[PDB]
């Protein structure tokens, strides 16, 4: 597993992600959005784990309306997953306290935890 | 009467016999003799195959011979041709690094779905099966959910102002290998049984 | 008998006296404990005049120089006692009907109590 | 006691001058997530003081998730209504009528006023 | 080993075994109140009662398994109808006078009484008979309730079951009888005539109490035992790195407790460690600030990285200072080290860096200090390395590490007798004042600051010391296997430290070196010390700097660009700093530390509310970009790879690292900074008054500088201006002023003045 | 034209819809059987379609398994447009008493929820309360706790896509 | 034509997915696909107290829930060796059979609707409503009632339950007959159901079809009879049977079962006298609520019981029970912890389904619907 990005910094993270995906076709990939708090999307923060199936990618919590210009970044993220033909979007709910510890765990463990907790989600809510 | 003929047979061939005074009885056959012996079991007059119950003993306080163990429930229906009402468990231990076991599909078509379930939830593959397809867990689910090393997968329960509960950090109840909240546990909390 | 009731009423009485000596000298009074048979009384009925089981007079430092208590509504051989901390001093109040509140055969008047409390404060109270 | 883990209680110390409960301790927060809640009443059954006791209201359907996590001050015996009910009854100024009637209220609910039977 | 059989099973077990421990070692169990790990069993609560045979020949009356020795070929019965009946009985006697507080009790889910009662209690009498819980239908004992004993400790006299655990503890382990029973019979109760609860170790009794009589006030009425998320970690407040457990629920630190780890801290924590948690979850900085209009502004991490590229665009790589925390992780120390290798710079240092590296000396293990023949002490153990006080309390009573059972540490160590006699001849202590421990030191001397060096010289034998110092010399001579313990004055002055190094080298003798920095020896071991040019942590040398703490103001003054990575917000920074950033406490960190004994310890992260805080690993990684260098470490795991390549051992492994280099610094004697337990950043809440600064002077010289016994005096140090209550002490050398060094600035001698 | 832009006309159509609210039930667990009670007592609702095509109101009644989510997704998408979603019971609304690998911990993940209805199962009359809610919700007669008036159709608010 | 009958549509009942391999109007083979309701109790319950689990037990077969309640309660009581009071046992047979009448009422309501027409769902619903009102009266809940306890049952029956059980016990004989009246003399249904749905006993046995859809093909096996538990051993008890297993016979058998159930209700109702209601062993049963204001031991045990709960011996256990869907039982592995080490639930509805590719093989398509309703599945039991 690769880890790119840094916590709480939306535009740098988006530019880096755009760099890293490339001409990879995503039709068999699974997209996991890691967040705390089910109800309130307005003050939400978002981290992302992408399981391509041939390799995995982690981004910390740099996304969402929680940070300035963050909403537009999450929206373009999901739009971009959608363009490469990613379809299967999932939402994972962690304790705020977890979020820092979760991404400091080793790749395999973090990934199994994420797939265990993740809820199938409409890509449209992040647009 | 058909049960006696099973136990008497197991004692001679060196098969260990488990008994709880609740009225439940087991017979553990080795891996080798399993397929054939059990073929003989249906042949022995065993109409009905009730269960295939998979067990993951990873987190069980005492050790057992191998990590996973499967229990079949064989019976002869009491209202049929000549039914005893003889019902009993046959247990077969299975290696962690070798989740193999012959199906009794040929024998009972009961063996069909149940062995598939035990494949889905635990990694155990059943030989000679018509179709081992994943049964229960979502198509794109990765792994085998009910085996102990696999997360129950809880999500925090949610309240008002930054307030959360993490169930696994909330739990008052202790498991078998749990210490408890004092220096140790003795007595009833190391296990208890009333005496009728 | 129903002497019980007059006892609880008299207990309320003694509490009143403690509160007074407290304000008078500018020295702390404290309500120590309420009745389990009130707290943990749920729907169950409660007729007692107060819900209060234990009280004390503390000095500046909060260490008590005088202690006072009554039996729960449900206990055998009901008494109200007084204890002087550190001094090994124990007193038992009964109630004889028509006479009043007595320690054995000696009447327990408010005055007697105030004197006992002052001796207590001056001797025992640290600040 | 809660199998759904739907009850959050932040605890607190009674003020001698002006008390809340009968011990030295009371409930600073009581939240219940109705959406998390399964409605066993293991909470009531666990409750030592007969504090928490399930009621009679069912008209609690509401539009927003977080409006559905009830607090202490929505649950006390004096209160008549559910959240959307009461909110409609303020935005209308037309009083609450619950859509239920009972023969009587349990001993454990004592103080809870309800429309009953022909007792009224 | 002595052959014992408990119930259905047989055990090997060393001769001096407590029957209780042979019981538990066989994997059985038996009620336990008065006896405690590391405490004298005295069959007191009489819970542990079992049966013993010696041939089938049963003894007439029951043995308290806690206070019974084991004999060769002995039998022990714990499940008999008669035993279980007796156990139930003692339990009923204990429950007899108790208060009825479970729902409302802070002892909540984990009460030795609750659990023992539910384990062994109500024996089965012989159906669905309707049975009675309670026989006794009379009035209970009612006494004083909810009584604060100290800003940190609360007392319920009703709950107390009169095991001896707290009083026993106070006399045996810390050695301060500030607690004992009062009257007798059933009237007996806990009280004190020493009101403060004076000891700096007082909070452990909260852990020991099998019931809720003694509870932790800083964490009173917060959450129930089960309800906390409990984060096992290690305490970074000083170099001994006790195991702790940081209870947090909903982002906030509720309560710190002791985590037992018999190699180093045993079952005990110090008051500053445990109650000094008030500040970590309390008032803390959650976003990056930038200087815009002569002042600070709340900003994105992005905008501040722009600011950061900007401020370093014009900067050459040897002008940058790199400065870490006394508690900085091995990963942070190592990555800072590797980045300053890459970016050629002469000055990188850490907050409690001592003129002489603690690496000079061979690390000593704690149990080595148990086995040693003599202990030579210069510096104050109580204040500099606090639980060392307690291990020296083990040392003095001749106690030595127990045989290790299947339930681990013995429950009743037959080896600890109650009320033990103490040797004064086993050690020599030399302190700048009459140290607390001077009670137990026959050879003991109050010296003054920077006088260590001359005691050490005397020990080497190049001159003749006082009566005391010649006695000390001679005892260390005759000492076959002594340990030398050295403080700040030793370690903060090159020559003293070298003489120590020398003496302790000549006789093959290990050292326990008390650094004002917690992670000092490891940060040293990751190669974080100043270089040739030599701007040190307190020196205004660099032109551009990164700071992980708050420096002397004389250091900040002058600099071109300054970037601080803190947890709370300092006033000293909003007038001197160009960029501020959020950091996690050690409570919420993840990474490694090195003990003053050379052991590597884990910090797990606590779910405290960090806000948008980030570990220094990430910050350094990000600060390297604006400078051109690409860093070798980003995250914890890769940092682990590089650490492991660097050959730092598994956790609980010892790291061996010596060093032979000194950086001396002159020390300007007017004021001394007394090394203190309580840390400056800890004075919040109830720790408010306890972490107060003090100024001590001999009443004569006090009188000269006009300093009254209760007064809050203003003081200026190069380390900043601190108010301090004035305490008169006749064991303090005349002509000096001891100011509480509530930081890792301890043991430094400084200019300054009492401002009026 | 979505029921909009004449004060007379939109109100008229909006009643039309609210009182017409045409439930398309999507049964899952025991909650579905608790809605089959609702079928009895019912009086703007309980004619179906049943076929999704023909209905405005989608009733999610029961635990929605994770494997089941993409299905319900298309059923919702495969509804005509002026459409509403009621979420019935704890399992649906939040994760319920089953907090785990198996089950969606809020149905609002996959389909835009209009109204939520707590209970395990909720009494049927509560679901009447919810359709009266949703009745009066599409009348634009509905408010949350913050003071805000609520939109007739949620999933007029999600980005489709 | 491999026709794809979807998950929830079109009226393939209870969220099943069916790949009817079918050319024409017959049925070649249906390749069944399940798992859409999988909640994962067997894992979840490893994380709940034995008490806590009693809230999760009714929730699988939600029609006959109390059979879950009964099976689990029993297997634990056995495992920890608890003694259930006679009046509790009687009430448990009453509730079990009443919940059975509820379940059955539902089964035939849906069946008659499924192919054939609408009307009789309503009368069955009326009687079911009287039953649910009974349950609400006693447990405060419609279903998923948290009532049964490892000792016994949560509390006693109120004054008003007895009178109301009689009312329904009065109308039901006439009532059950009215449903029967329409059916037994089946107008179209006869030419609709008599031929369809083939069940050989030998294959029922080979594929393991236990659940009362077994006796409709002429094998005589009832758990209340074959392996008696709760004192069914002591009742006047008729077990209805079928001739050759079709749709029709299954369908009537359960209707007979309803009057016999009602006869068990009346019978048990006769034998009921005042007493206590759960096993007083405090290890097993939380203290009386009244003395929480007096006894130390009470409070300790209350607190402990409702937090940690209790620890049964290390052991495995299982007991068989009869639901309206067949053999049900809990296989409980306890490790001596406060929560079960593992609970595997023997799901009758799960084994019963191996015989549908068999059952509807060669049948009609309109009938392929009816032949499903006739097998009476409940998916909560299946997926689980
Ligand atoms: S009824 Fe009580 S115990 Fe049960 S889920 Fe609701 S809050 Fe929890
Ligand atoms: S000390 Fe223990 S037994 Fe007593 S009230 Fe507290 S928790 Fe209960
Ligand atoms: S206060 Fe606690 S530790 Fe001290 S004697 Fe009493 S019960 Fe034992
Ligand atoms: S002795 Fe040192 S390491 Fe231990 S708790 Fe106290 S400050 Fe922390
Ligand atoms: S909320 Fe309750 S009634 Fe509804 S599906 Fe979930 S378990 Fe069943
Ligand atoms: S007597 Fe207290 S444990 Fe031995």
UniProtKB/Swiss-Prot annotation, chain B:
Cellular component, GO annotation: plasma membrane
Cellular localisation: Cell membrane
SUPFAM superfamilies listed in its UniProt record: Nqo5-like
Pfam families per UniProt: Complex1_30kDa
This protein's record includes keyword Transferase: no
Keyword Coiled coil listed: no
Signal peptide span: none
Reaction catalysed by this enzyme: a quinone + NADH + 5 H(+)(in) = a quinol + NAD(+) + 4 H(+)(out)
Keyword vocabulary terms for this entry: Cell membrane, Membrane, NAD, Quinone, Translocase, Transport
Membrane topology per record: Peripheral membrane protein
Gene3D superfamilies according to UniProt: NADH:ubiquinone oxidoreductase, 30kDa subunit (3.30.460.80)
Gene Ontology MF terms: NADH dehydrogenase (ubiquinone) activity; NADH:ubiquinone reductase (non-electrogenic) activity; quinone binding
EC code: 7.1.1.-
Main location: membrane
Source species, domain of life: Bacteria
Description of how the protein assembles with itself and partners: NDH-1 is composed of 15 different subunits, Nqo1 to Nqo15. The complex has a L-shaped structure, with the hydrophobic arm (subunits Nqo7, Nqo8 and Nqo10 to Nqo14) embedded in the membrane and the hydrophilic peripheral arm (subunits Nqo1 to Nqo6, Nqo9 and Nqo15) protruding into the bacterial cytoplasm. The hydrophilic domain contains all the redox centers.
Family: Belongs to the complex I 30 kDa subunit family.
Protein name: NADH-quinone oxidoreductase subunit 5
Record organism: Thermus thermophilus (strain ATCC 27634 / DSM 579 / HB8)
Underlying gene: nqo5
Curated annotation (Swiss-Prot), chain C:
Quaternary structure note: NDH-1 is composed of 15 different subunits, Nqo1 to Nqo15. The complex has a L-shaped structure, with the hydrophobic arm (subunits Nqo7, Nqo8 and Nqo10 to Nqo14) embedded in the membrane and the hydrophilic peripheral arm (subunits Nqo1 to Nqo6, Nqo9 and Nqo15) protruding into the bacterial cytoplasm. The hydrophilic domain contains all the redox centers. Nqo15 is bound to the side of the complex near the N-terminus of Nqo3, where it interacts with subunits Nqo3, Nqo2, Nqo1, Nqo9 and Nqo4.
EC id: 7.1.1.-
GO CC terms: plasma membrane
Record's subcellular location: Cell membrane
SUPFAM superfamilies: Frataxin/Nqo15-like
Broad class of where this protein is predominantly found: membrane
Keyword Cell membrane: yes
Protein name: NADH-quinone oxidoreductase subunit 15
EC class (word): translocase
Pfam families per record: NADH_Oxid_Nqo15 (PF11497)
Any one GO molecular function term: ferric iron binding
This protein's encoding gene: nqo15
From Swiss-Prot, chain D:
Topological relation to the membrane, as annotated: Peripheral membrane protein
Needed co-factor(s): [4Fe-4S] cluster
Ligand binding ([4Fe-4S] cluster 1): 47
Residues that bind [4Fe-4S] cluster 2: 2, 37-38, 40, 43
Location within or outside the cell: Cell membrane
Annotated Gene Ontology cellular component terms: plasma membrane
GO molecular function: 4 iron, 4 sulfur cluster binding; iron ion binding; NADH:ubiquinone reductase (non-electrogenic) activity; quinone binding
Top EC class of this enzyme: translocase
Keywords assigned by UniProt, alphabetized: 4Fe-4S, Cell membrane, Iron, Iron-sulfur, Membrane, Metal-binding, NAD, Quinone, Repeat, Translocase
Residue ranges constituting the 4Fe-4S ferredoxin-type domain according to the UniProt record: 28-57
Example GO BP: aerobic respiration
Reactions it catalyzes: a quinone + NADH + 5 H(+)(in) = a quinol + NAD(+) + 4 H(+)(out)
Main localization of the protein described in the UniProt heading: membrane
Disulphide bridges: none
Enzyme Commission (EC) number: 7.1.1.-
Co-factor: note: Binds 2 [4Fe-4S] clusters per subunit. The [4Fe-4S] clusters are referred to as N6a and N6b.
Function: NDH-1 shuttles electrons from NADH, via FMN and iron-sulfur (Fe-S) centers, to quinones in the respiratory chain. The immediate electron acceptor for the enzyme in this species is menaquinone. Couples the redox reaction to proton translocation (for every two electrons transferred, four hydrogen ions are translocated across the cytoplasmic membrane), and thus conserves the redox energy in a proton gradient required for the synthesis of ATP.
Family: Belongs to the complex I 23 kDa subunit family.
Protein name: NADH-quinone oxidoreductase subunit 9
Organism this protein belongs to: Thermus thermophilus (strain ATCC 27634 / DSM 579 / HB8)
Gene it is expressed from: nqo9
Shown residues within the full chain: 62 to 181 of 182
Swiss-Prot record, chain E:
Protein residues bound to [2Fe-2S] cluster: 34, 45, 48, 66
EC number in record: 7.1.1.-
SUPFAM superfamilies xrefs: 2Fe-2S ferredoxin-like, 4Fe-4S ferredoxins, ADC-like, Formate dehydrogenase/DMSO reductase, domains 1-3
Residues of the 2Fe-2S ferredoxin-type domain: 1-82
Bound cofactor: record note: Binds 1 [2Fe-2S] cluster per subunit. The [2Fe-2S] cluster 1 is referred to as N1b.
4Fe-4S Mo/W bis-MGD-type domain segment(s): 228-284
One Pfam family of this chain: NADH-G_4Fe-4S_3
Any one cellular-component term (Gene Ontology): plasma membrane
Binding site for [4Fe-4S] cluster 2: 160, 163, 166, 209
Biological process according to GO: ATP synthesis coupled electron transport
Keywords tagged on the record: 2Fe-2S, 4Fe-4S, Cell membrane, Iron, Iron-sulfur, Membrane, Metal-binding, NAD, Quinone, Translocase
Main location: membrane
Required cofactor names: [2Fe-2S] cluster; [4Fe-4S] cluster
Gene3D superfamilies assigned: 2.40.40.20, 3.10.20.740, 3.30.70.20, 3.40.50.740, ADC-like domains
CDD domains named in the record: fer2
SMART domains, sorted: Molybdop_Fe4S4 (SM00926), NADH-G_4Fe-4S_3 (SM00929)
Binding-site residues, [4Fe-4S] cluster 3: 235, 238, 242, 270
Known outcome of mutating residue 238 to A: Decreases amount and stability of iron-sulfur center 4
Positions contributing to [4Fe-4S] cluster 1 binding: 98, 102, 105, 111
Coiled coil regions, renumbered to chain: none
Cellular location(s): Cell membrane
Gene Ontology MF annotations: 2 iron, 2 sulfur cluster binding; 4 iron, 4 sulfur cluster binding; metal ion binding; molybdopterin cofactor binding; NADH dehydrogenase (ubiquinone) activity; quinone binding
Comment, domains: The subunit comprises two main parts, an N-terminal [FeFe]-hydrogenase-like domain (residues 1 to 240) that coordinates clusters 1, 2 and 3, and a domain similar to molybdopterin-containing enzymes (residues 241 to 767) whose first subdomain coordinates cluster 4.
Name the UniProt record assigns to this protein: NADH-quinone oxidoreductase subunit 3
Organism of derivation: Thermus thermophilus (strain ATCC 27634 / DSM 579 / HB8)
Name of the coding gene: nqo3
């Amino acid at each position: 597993m690769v880890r790119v990005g840094m916590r709480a910094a939306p535009r740098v993270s988006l530019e880096a992600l755009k760099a890293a995906l490339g001409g990879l076709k995503l039709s068999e990939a699974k997209v996991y959005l890691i967040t705390d708090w089910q109800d309130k999307r307005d003050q939400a923060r978002y981290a992302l784990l992408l399981h391509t199936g041939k390799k995995d990618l982690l981004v910390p919590d740099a996304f969402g309306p929680a940070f300035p210009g963050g909403e537009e970044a999450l929206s373009e993220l999901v739009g971009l997953l959608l363009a490469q033909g990613a379809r299967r979007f999932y939402e994972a709910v962690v304790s705020p306290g977890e979020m820092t510890a979760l991404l400091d765990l080793p790749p395999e463990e973090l990934l199994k935890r994420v797939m265990a907790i993740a809820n199938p989600t409409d890509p449209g809510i992040y647009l | 009467m058909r049960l006696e003929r099973v136990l008497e047979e197991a004692r001679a061939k060196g098969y260990p016999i488990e008994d709880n005074g609740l009225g439940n009885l087991w017979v553990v056959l080795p891996r080798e003799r399993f397929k054939e012996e059990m073929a003989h079991y249906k042949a022995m007059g065993f109409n009905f195959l009730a269960d295939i119950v998979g067990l993951d003993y990873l987190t069980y306080p005492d050790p057992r011979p191998e990590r996973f163990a499967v229990v079949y429930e064989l019976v002869s229906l009491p209202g049929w041709k000549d039914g005893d009402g003889s019902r009993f468990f046959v247990r077969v231990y299975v290696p962690e690094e070798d989740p193999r076991l012959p199906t009794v599909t040929d024998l009972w078509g009961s063996a069909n779905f149940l062995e598939r379930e035990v494949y889905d939830l635990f990694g155990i593959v059943f030989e000679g099966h018509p179709d081992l397809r994943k049964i229960l867990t979502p198509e794109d689910l990765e792994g085998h959910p009910l085996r102990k090393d696999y997360p129950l997968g809880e999500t925090p329960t949610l309240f008002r102002e930054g307030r959360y509960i993490i169930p696994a950090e909330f739990r008052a109840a202790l498991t078998g290998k749990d210490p408890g909240l004092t220096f140790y546990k003795g007595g009833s909390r190391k296990g208890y049984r009333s005496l009728w | 008998a129903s002497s019980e009731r007059e006892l609880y009423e008299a207990w309320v009485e003694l509490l009143s006296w403690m509160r007074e000596y407290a304000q008078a000298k500018g020295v702390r009074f404290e309500k120590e404990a309420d009745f389990p048979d009130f707290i943990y009384r749920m729907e169950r009925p409660y007729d007692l005049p107060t819900t209060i089981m234990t009280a004390s007079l503390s000095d500046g430092l909060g260490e008590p120089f005088l202690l006072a208590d009554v039996s729960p509504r449900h206990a055998k051989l009901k008494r109200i006692g007084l204890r002087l901390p550190r001094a090994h001093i124990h007193l038992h109040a009964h109630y004889e009907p028509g006479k009043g509140l007595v320690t054995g055969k000696i009447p327990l008047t408010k005055e007697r109590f105030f004197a006992l409390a002052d001796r207590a404060r001056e001797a025992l109270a640290f600040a | 006691a809660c199998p759904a883990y739907a009850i959050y209680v932040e605890p607190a110390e009674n003020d001698p001058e002006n008390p809340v409960s009968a011990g030295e301790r009371y409930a600073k927060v009581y939240e219940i997530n109705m959406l998390r809640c399964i409605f066993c009443g293991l909470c009531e059954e666990a409750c030592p003081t007969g504090a928490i006791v399930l009621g009679y209201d069912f008209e609690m359907a509401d539009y927003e998730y977080s409006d559905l996590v009830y607090g202490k001050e929505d649950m006390l015996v004096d209160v008549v209504g559910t959240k959307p009910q009461r909110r409609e009854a303020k935005r209308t100024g037309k009083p609450v009528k619950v859509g239920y009637v009972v023969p009587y209220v349990r001993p454990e609910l004592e103080g809870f006023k309800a429309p009953t039977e022909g007792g009224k | 080993m002595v052959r014992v059989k408990v119930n259905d099973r047989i055990v090997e077990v060393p001769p001096g075994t407590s029957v209780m421990d042979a019981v538990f070692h066989a994997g059985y169990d038996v009620p336990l109140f008065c006896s405690e790990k590391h405490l004298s069993p005295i069959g007191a609560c009489r819970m542990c009662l079992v049966r013993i045979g010696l041939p089938i020949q049963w003894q007439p009356k029951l043995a308290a398994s806690c206070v019974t020795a084991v004999a060769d070929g002995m039998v022990v019965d714990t499940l008999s109808d008669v035993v279980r009946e007796a156990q139930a009985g003692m339990v009923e006697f204990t429950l007899l006078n108790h208060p009825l507080d479970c729902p409302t009790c802070d002892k909540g889910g984990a009460c030795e009484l609750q659990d023992r009662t539910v384990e062994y209690g109500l024996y089965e009498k012989y159906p669905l008979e309707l049975p009675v819980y309670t026989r006794f239908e009379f009035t209970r004992r009612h006494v004083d309730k909810h009584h604060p004993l100290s800003p940190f400790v609360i007392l319920d006299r009703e709950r107390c079951i009169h095991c001896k655990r707290c009083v026993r503890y106070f006399e045996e382990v810390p050695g301060d009888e500030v607690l004992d029973f009062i009257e007798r019979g059933v009237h007996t109760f806990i009280g004190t005539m020493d009101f403060g609860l004076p000891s700096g170790f007082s909070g452990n009794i909260t852990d020991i109490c099998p019931v809720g009589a003694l509870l932790d006030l800083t964490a009173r009425f917060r959450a129930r035992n089960w309800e906390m998320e409990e984060t096992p970690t290690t305490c970074a407040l000083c170099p001994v790195g006790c195991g702790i457990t940081a209870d947090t629920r909903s982002g906030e630190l509720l309560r710190i407790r002791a985590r037992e780890v018999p190699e180093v801290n045993e079952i005990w924590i110090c008051d500053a460690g445990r109650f000094g948690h008030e500040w970590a979850d309390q008032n803390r900085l959650k976003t990056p600030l930038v200087r815009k209009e002569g002042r600070l502004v709340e900003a994105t991490w992005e905008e501040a990285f722009l600011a950061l590229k900007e401020g370093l665009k014009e900067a050459r790589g040897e002008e940058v200072g790199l400065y870490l925390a006394h508690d900085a992780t091995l990963e942070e120390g190592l990555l800072a080290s590797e980045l300053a290798k890459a970016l050629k710079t002469p000055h990188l240092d850490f907050q409690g860096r001592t003129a002489a590296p603690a690496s000079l000396f061979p690390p000593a293990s704690l149990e080595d200090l148990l086995q040693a023949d003599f202990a030579l002490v210069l510096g104050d153990p109580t204040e500099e390395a606090p639980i060392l006080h307690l291990r020296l309390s083990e040392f003095v009573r001749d106690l030595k590490p127990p045989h290790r059972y299947n339930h681990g540490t013995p429950f009743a160590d037959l080896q600890i007798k109650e009320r033990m006699p103490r040797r004064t001849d086993k050690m020599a202590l030399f302190a700048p004042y009459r140290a607390p421990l001077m009670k137990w030191a026959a050879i003991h001397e109050v010296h003054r600051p920077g006088e260590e060096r001359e005691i050490l010289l005397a020990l080497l034998g190049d001159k003749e010391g006082s009566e005391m110092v010649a006695k000390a010399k001679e005892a260390w001579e005759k000492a076959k296997n002594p340990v030398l313990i050295l403080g700040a004055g030793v370690l903060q002055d090159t020559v003293a430290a070298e003489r120590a190094r020398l003496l302790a080298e000549r006789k093959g003798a290990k050292v326990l070196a008390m650094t004002p920095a917690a992670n000092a020896r490891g940060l040293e071991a990751m190669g974080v010390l100043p270089g040739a040019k030599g701007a040190s942590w307190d020196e205004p040398g660099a032109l551009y700097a990164y700071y992980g703490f708050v420096p002397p103001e004389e250091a900040l003054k002058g600099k071109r660009f300054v970037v601080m990575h803190l947890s709370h917000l300092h006033p000293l920074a909003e007038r001197y700093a160009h960029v501020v950033l959020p950091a996690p406490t050690f409570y919420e960190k993840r990474g490694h530390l090195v003990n003053l004994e050379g052991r590597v310890l884990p910090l797990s992260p606590a779910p405290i509310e960090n806000g948008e805080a980030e570990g220094a690993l990430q910050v350094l990684a990000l600060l390297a970009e604006a400078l051109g260098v690409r860093p070798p470490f980003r995250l914890h795991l890769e940092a682990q790879k590089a650490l492991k390549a660097r050959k730092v051992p598994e956790a609980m492994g010892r790291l061996s690292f010596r060093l032979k280099e000194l950086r001396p610094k002159e020390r300007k004697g007017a004021f001394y900074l007394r090394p203190t337990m309580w840390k400056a950043h800890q004075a919040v809440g109830k720790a408010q008054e306890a972490a107060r600064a003090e100024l001590w002077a001999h009443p004569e010289t006090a009188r000269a500088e006009a300093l009254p016994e209760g007064a809050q005096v203003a003081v200026e140090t190069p380390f900043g201006r601190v108010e301090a209550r004035v305490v008169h002490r006749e064991d303090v050398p005349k002509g000096h002023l001891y100011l509480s060094a509530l930081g890792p600035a301890a043991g430094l001698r400084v200019e300054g003045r009492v401002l009026v | 034209r979505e029921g909009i832009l004449f004060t007379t006309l939109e109100k008229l159509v909006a009643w039309g819809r609210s009182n017409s609210l045409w439930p398309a039930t999507f049964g899952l667990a025991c909650c579905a059987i608790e809605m089959m009670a609702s079928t009895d007592a019912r009086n703007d609702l309980a004619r179906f379609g049943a076929s999704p095509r023909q209905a405005d109101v989608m009733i999610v009644a029961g635990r929605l398994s994770k494997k089941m989510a993409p299905v319900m997704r298309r059923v919702w998408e495969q509804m005509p447009d002026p459409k509403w979603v009621i979420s019935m019971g704890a399992c649906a609304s939040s994760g319920g008493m089953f907090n785990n690998y198996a089950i969606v911990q809020n149905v609002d993940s996959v389909v835009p929820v209009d109204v939520y209805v707590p209970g395990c199962p909720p009494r049927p009359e509560a679901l009447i309360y919810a359709v009266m809610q949703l009745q009066k919700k599409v009348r634009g007669q509905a408010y949350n706790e913050r003071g805000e008036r609520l939109p007739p159709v949620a999933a007029w608010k999600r980005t489709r896509g | 034509m491999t026709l794809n009958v979807g998950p929830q549509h079109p009226s393939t009942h209870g969220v099943l997915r069916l790949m009817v391999t079918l050319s024409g109007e017959e049925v070649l083979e249906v390749v069944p696909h399940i798992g859409y309701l999988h909640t994962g109790f067997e894992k979840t319950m490893e994380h709940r107290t034995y008490l806590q689990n009693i809230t999760y037990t009714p929730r699988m077969d939600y029609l006959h829930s109390f059979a879950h309640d009964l099976a689990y309660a029993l297997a634990v009581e056995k495992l920890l060796g608890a003694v259930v009071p006679p009046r509790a046992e009687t009430i448990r047979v009453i509730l079990n059979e009443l919940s059975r009448l509820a379940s059955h009422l539902v089964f035939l309501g849906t069946g008659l609707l499924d192919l054939g027409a609408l009307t009789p769902f309503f009368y069955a619903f009326r009687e079911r409503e009287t039953i649910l009102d009974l349950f609400e009266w006693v447990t405060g809940q419609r279903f998923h009632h948290n009532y049964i306890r490892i000792g016994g049952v949560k509390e006693d029956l109120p004054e008003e339950f007895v009178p109301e059980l009689k009312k329904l016990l009065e109308v039901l004989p006439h009532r059950i007959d009215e449903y029967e009246a329409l059916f037994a003399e089946s107008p179209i249904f006869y030419e609709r159901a008599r031929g369809v749905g083939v069940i050989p006993p030998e294959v029922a046995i080979d594929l393991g079809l236990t659940g009362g859809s077994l006796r409709a093909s002429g094998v005589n096996y009832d758990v209340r009879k074959a392996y008696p538990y709760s004192g069914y051993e002591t009742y006047t008890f008729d077990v209805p049977l079928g001739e050759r297993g079709d749709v029709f016979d299954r369908m009537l058998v359960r209707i007979r079962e309803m009057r016999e159930s009602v006869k068990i209700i009346k019978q048990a109702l006769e034998r009921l006298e005042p007493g206590p209601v759960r096993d007083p062993n405090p290890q097993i049963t939380p203290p009386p609520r009244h003395l929480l204001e007096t006894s130390m031991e009470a409070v300790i045990y209350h607190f402990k019981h409702y937090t940690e709960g209790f620890h049964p011996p290390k052991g495995e256990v299982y007991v068989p029970t009869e639901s309206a869907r067949g053999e049900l039982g809990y296989y409980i592995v306890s490790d001596g912890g406060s929560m079960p080490y593992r609970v595997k639930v023997r799901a009758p509805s799960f084994v019963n389904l191996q015989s549908l590719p068999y059952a509807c093989k060669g049948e009609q398509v309109p009938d392929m619907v009816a032949i499903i309703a006739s097998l009476d599945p409940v998916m909560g039991d299946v997926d689980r």
